Design a protein around this nucleic acid. Structure first.
Ligand SMILES: [Mg+2]
Ligand SMILES: [Mg+2]
Ligand SMILES: [Mg+2]
Ligand SMILES: [Mg+2]
Ligand SMILES: [Mg+2]
Ligand SMILES: [Mg+2]
Ligand SMILES: [Mg+2]
Ligand SMILES: [Mg+2]
Ligand SMILES: [Mg+2]
Ligand SMILES: [Mg+2]
Ligand SMILES: [Mg+2]
Ligand SMILES: [Mg+2]
Ligand SMILES: [Mg+2]
Ligand SMILES: [Mg+2]
Ligand SMILES: [Mg+2]
Ligand SMILES: [Mg+2]
Ligand SMILES: [Mg+2]
Ligand SMILES: [Mg+2]
Ligand code: NA
Lengths: 271, 77, 100, 149
RNA sequence: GUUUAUUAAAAACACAGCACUGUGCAAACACGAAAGUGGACGUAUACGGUGUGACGCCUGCCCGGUGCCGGGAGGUUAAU
């Protein structure tokens, strides 16, 4: 799965590819596609609000079923498909009634496996249940934060959530960041980890590989002039300043979370 | 905009005076809050963006009295 | 065919549903062309130490002759059943019918 | 805020007092519900002078037929359908919704919000001691059973 | 590869890689008086910021100063 490229040229010497032979070679399921136009990090006002965004390959958007609300009807996986939008791979599933959908592909999922959602579903991976029927200690992913919201936690490749406790109406989750968080037990989760766990093992190898992922170069603040960045100035590699964002806020350790609305759900912050 | 529907209170302008009496322009904003008011006559709730003083006015008078004045002014609710 | 000895302890609040559990599992083994040799039901026994802050666990013993796949799905049933505490499956290399 | 009451309030009401409540209590709870109206002199005579007895009789003849539950036990200990697996373990829980409609003739007779569940929504096969608040002091104690069909 | 259009193409910038740090999602952050938008129809194997800069072998001591993080007993301390 992880292949080192031979150094036939610089820019190829350090490339490490993540090759999955089970990904569908061919076109994605057209009914579940739609346009996803690039923004270049610009917003309503046409101004850069997120730096280092722009370019990269054109990408169609795959409508992935995060809700997983086709309860009781079994589905069979037919393809593992590459998704340019997420780090995870997606699986095309066919329900018994003839409906096809895209779901996040869990680790042990391949073509032909059976999945279903609902309260009566089994505890095999790829099945979606409320975290009230899922046993405590189970490894889940695609976790809803509100009942019916859709599933926002543990969606990246190789990620998962551990159900740590169930105090009746709520369930405590250990997130991939190490944070303990309360979630309503009626929220839904898919059993197993997210597949494509070797995604983090890839090495881009060259500047161009990041460029065609839509990532524009980052200029260090200390390389700028004082008018551009709080870092910057000096007759050759001077810093003499506490590291800050381009807008003067201290970076290198300073809590920026200020919600007061969701702290009731956070059992313990990450460490 | 930030206007009380009952009293007509809107942002007024003033100065920030420092200890050195430096004057910088500032706005005084009304204490506005959207609030669903129960209209006993019409068997329904009417949401109004009112200042806190506007709420006190609605308690002093009736809600119907204030709605009549709002209707007279052309203020839609 | 392999001989297994299954001892599983049940929460002493679902004990009145234990007979429902018993015939569900025996049907699974018999349905899969197995055969139950012993089906002793020891009832509500004191534990030697608290398990899940409990005592009085309901012990059920059964010696069966089933194929592997039935046993694993039986163990899976025990694992995901919260009314079952501390199941225990062992090979016995012989059918056992004598009482305990 | 001075307010004149229209019915029995738990901790400050005697159906005719002019207690001094906080503005939020009157504005958001007491007035929008039929419990009190502001104590303007307009209302005070327009309360005391002519209805100091007719709303008293209306409340009393309304407390009657509400204190008349007639649903302390509707038919028997009512048995309600549900979908569940083994070991009890109600898959689809029973809530204030399902209790109300099933206990009555398809929910027409009784409303949905007067169902009190001390144990919360029902999550296991069995009979549970659910309450029923038809009126401000009415506690109907129907036993509801749930069966996995 | 990029750069001072019009005296500087470089050892400068970027870079893949590395590390720290923030961020549990109505994310942080940014643009906006706000609505809203980008981040992202993404979800910690993600995203932002900062420094360093393939790779190899490595990265030692100091928390006194400044900053940041945590604690709150005590002292001081605003409006009221
Ligand atoms: Mg960036
Ligand atoms: Mg970088
Ligand atoms: Mg840089
Ligand atoms: Mg310079
Ligand atoms: Mg500056
Ligand atoms: Mg500098
Ligand atoms: Mg410099
Ligand atoms: Mg120097
Ligand atoms: Mg250029
Ligand atoms: Mg040029
Ligand atoms: Mg030049
Ligand atoms: Mg020049
Ligand atoms: Mg030149
Ligand atoms: Mg420079
Ligand atoms: Mg340069
Ligand atoms: Mg450098
Ligand atoms: Mg120190
Ligand atoms: Mg401190
Ligand atoms: Na220090």
């Amino acid at each position: 799965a992880v292949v080192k490229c031979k150094p036939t040229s610089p820019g190829r010497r350090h490339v490490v590819k993540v090759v999955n032979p089970e990904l569908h070679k061919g076109k994605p399921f057209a009914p579940l596609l739609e346009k996803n136009s690039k923004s270049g990090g610009r917003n309503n006002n046409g101004r850069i609000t997120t730096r280092h965004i722009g370019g990269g390959h054109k990408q169609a958007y795959r409508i992935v079923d995060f809700k997983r609300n086709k309860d009781g009807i079994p589905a069979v996986v037919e393809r593992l498909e590459y998704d340019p939008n997420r780090s995870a791979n997606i699986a095309l599933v066919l329900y018994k009634d003839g409906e096809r959908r895209y779901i996040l592909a869990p680790k042990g999922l391949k073509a032909g496996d059976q999945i279903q959602s609902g309260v009566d579903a089994a505890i095999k991976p790829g099945n979606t249940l409320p975290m009230r029927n899922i046993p405590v200690g189970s490894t889940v992913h695609n976790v809803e934060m509100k009942p019916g919201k859709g599933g926002q936690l543990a969606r990246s490749a190789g990620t998962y959530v551990q159900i740590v406790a169930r105090d009746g109406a709520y369930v405590t989750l250990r997130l991939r960041s190490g944070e303990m968080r309360k979630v309503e037990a009626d929220c839904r989760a898919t059993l197993g980890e997210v597949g494509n766990a070797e995604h983090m093992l890839r090495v881009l190898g060259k500047a161009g590989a990041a460029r065609w992922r839509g990532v524009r170069p980052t200029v260090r603040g200390t390389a700028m002039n004082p008018v551009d960045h709080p870092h910057g100035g000096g007759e050759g590699r001077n810093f003499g300043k506490h590291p800050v964002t381009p807008w003067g806020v201290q970076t290198k350790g300073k809590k920026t979370r200020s919600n007061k609305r969701t702290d009731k759900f956070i059992v313990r912050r990450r460490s | 905009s930030r206007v009380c529907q009952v009293t007509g209170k809107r942002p007024v302008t003033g100065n920030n005076r420092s200890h050195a009496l430096n004057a910088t322009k500032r706005r005084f904003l009304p204490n506005l809050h959207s609030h669903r008011f129960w209209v006993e006559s019409e068997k329904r709730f009417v949401t109004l963006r009112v200042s806190a003083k506007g709420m006190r006015v609605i308690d002093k008078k009736g809600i119907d009295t204030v709605l009549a004045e709002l209707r007279a002014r052309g203020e839609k609710y | 065919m392999r001989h297994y000895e299954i001892v599983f302890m049940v929460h002493p609040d679902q004990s009145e549903q234990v007979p429902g559990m018993i015939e569900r599992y025996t049907a699974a083994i018999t349905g899969a062309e197995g055969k139950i040799h012993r089906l002793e039901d020891w009832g509500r026994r004191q534990l030697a130490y608290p398990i899940n802050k409990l005592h009085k666990a309901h012990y059920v013993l059964m010696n069966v002759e089933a194929p592997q796949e039935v046993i694993d799905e039986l163990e899976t049933t025990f694992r995901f059943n919260d009314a079952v505490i501390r199941s225990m499956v062992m090979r016995t290399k012989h059918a056992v019918t004598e009482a305990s | 805020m001075q307010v004149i009451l229209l019915d029995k309030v738990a901790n400050l009401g005697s159906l005719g007092d002019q207690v001094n409540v906080k503005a939020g209590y009157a504005r958001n709870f007491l007035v929008p519900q039929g419990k009190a109206v502001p104590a303007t002199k307009k209302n005070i005579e327009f309360f005391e002078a002519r209805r100091a007895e007719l709303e008293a009789k209306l409340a009393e003849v309304l407390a009657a037929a509400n204190a008349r539950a007639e649903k302390i036990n509707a038919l028997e200990t009512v048995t309600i359908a549900s979908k569940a697996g083994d070991e009890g373990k109600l898959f689809g829980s029973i809530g204030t919704r399902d209790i109300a409609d099933a206990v009555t003739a398809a929910g027409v007779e009784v409303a949905k919000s007067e169902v009190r569940l001390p144990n919360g929504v029902l999550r296991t096969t069995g009979e549970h001691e659910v309450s029923f608040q038809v009126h401000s002091e009415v506690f109907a104690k129907v036993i509801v059973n749930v069966v996995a069909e």
